[PDB]
Design an enzyme around this catalytic site. Structure first.
Site, short mmCIF file in Angstrom:
data_model
loop_
_atom_site.label_atom_id
_atom_site.label_comp_id
_atom_site.label_asym_id
_atom_site.label_seq_id
_atom_site.Cartn_x
_atom_site.Cartn_y
_atom_site.Cartn_z
CG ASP A 21 19.33 -11.65 -17.54
OD1 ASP A 21 20.02 -10.63 -17.39
OD2 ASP A 21 18.09 -11.61 -17.68
CD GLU A 23 13.86 -10.82 -16.78
OE1 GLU A 23 13.33 -9.82 -16.25
OE2 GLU A 23 14.79 -10.74 -17.59
CG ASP A 119 20.57 -10.49 -12.31
OD1 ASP A 119 19.69 -9.80 -11.79
OD2 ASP A 119 20.49 -10.95 -13.46
CG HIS A 177 13.12 -6.59 -20.43
ND1 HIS A 177 14.28 -6.20 -19.79
CD2 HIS A 177 12.65 -5.49 -21.07
CE1 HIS A 177 14.51 -4.92 -20.05
NE2 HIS A 177 13.53 -4.46 -20.81
CG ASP A 182 17.75 -10.59 -21.39
OD1 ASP A 182 17.30 -10.31 -22.51
OD2 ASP A 182 17.51 -9.88 -20.39
MG LIG Z 1 16.83 -10.21 -18.15
#
Ligand SMILES: [Mg+2]
Length: 206
Positions: A21, A23, A119, A177, A182
């Site tokens: 995951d 950011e 992603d 987040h 996550d």
């Molecule tokens: Mg995330």
């Protein structure tokens, strides 16, 4: 509850699941978006237990100063991305990690797992294309957990991890987040679905 004793943790199609995951730089929106956190969790394919962790923050170059929106959303402050390697360097490090973890042997089967398709469908290949970097073949097949979950539960989790945690009576792990947190939540959801006998399958179109 004995109901699940034989069903739980069935044989799976993969030796390992690789939970990822990102950011990224962002606002409310700036372009090109740049990955600023790169987590991977290597899960035992049978038990869903975390066996190895790749985690790097990444220094963005086009918009190097993280925005108030970005920081307040992700928790990632400027100090966390400042001395850090670029995405190209981080991708070489991922490849070394895949090698070291035995994940690049043709006999060892693994697949990425993400919450949503963004992603690996959009973010990674987009930024790679922008940078002139190839996308390693192992990033090109994945499982969207939201889709796995909707098959298992007969119900689409519009609000992602928070809806899936709600539906499975799971307490949220860490901070929403945050890439790594996550990932830990994805891993926990997978564990619970596996306990109920769910067999994970690629959702990514070939
Ligand atoms: Mg995330």
């Amino acid at each position: 509850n004995l109901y699940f004793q034989s069903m739980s943790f069935p044989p799976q199609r993969y030796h390992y699941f690789l939970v990822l995951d990102f950011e990224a730089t962002c606002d409310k929106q700036i372009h090109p978006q740049e990955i600023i956190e790169f987590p991977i969790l290597k899960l035992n394919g049978r038990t869903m237990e975390i066996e190895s962790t790749f985690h790097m923050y990444v220094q963005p170059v086009v918009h190097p100063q993280l925005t108030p929106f970005c920081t307040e959303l992700t928790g990632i402050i400027q100090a966390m991305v400042d001395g850090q390697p670029s995405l190209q360097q981080v991708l070489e490090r991922v490849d070394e990690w895949m090698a070291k973890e035995g994940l690049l042997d043709p006999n060892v089967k693994s697949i990425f797992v993400t919450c949503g398709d963004w992603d690996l469908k959009v973010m990674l290949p987009g930024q790679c294309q922008y940078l002139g970097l190839p996308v390693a073949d192992y990033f090109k097949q994945w499982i969207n957990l939201k889709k796995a979950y909707s098959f298992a539960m007969g119900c689409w989790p519009k609000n992602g991890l928070l809806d899936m945690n709600k539906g499975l009576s799971l307490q949220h792990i860490g901070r929403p987040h945050s890439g790594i947190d996550d990932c830990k939540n994805i891993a926990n959801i997978m564990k619970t679905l596996a306990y109920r006998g769910f067999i994970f399958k690629q959702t990514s179109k070939p």
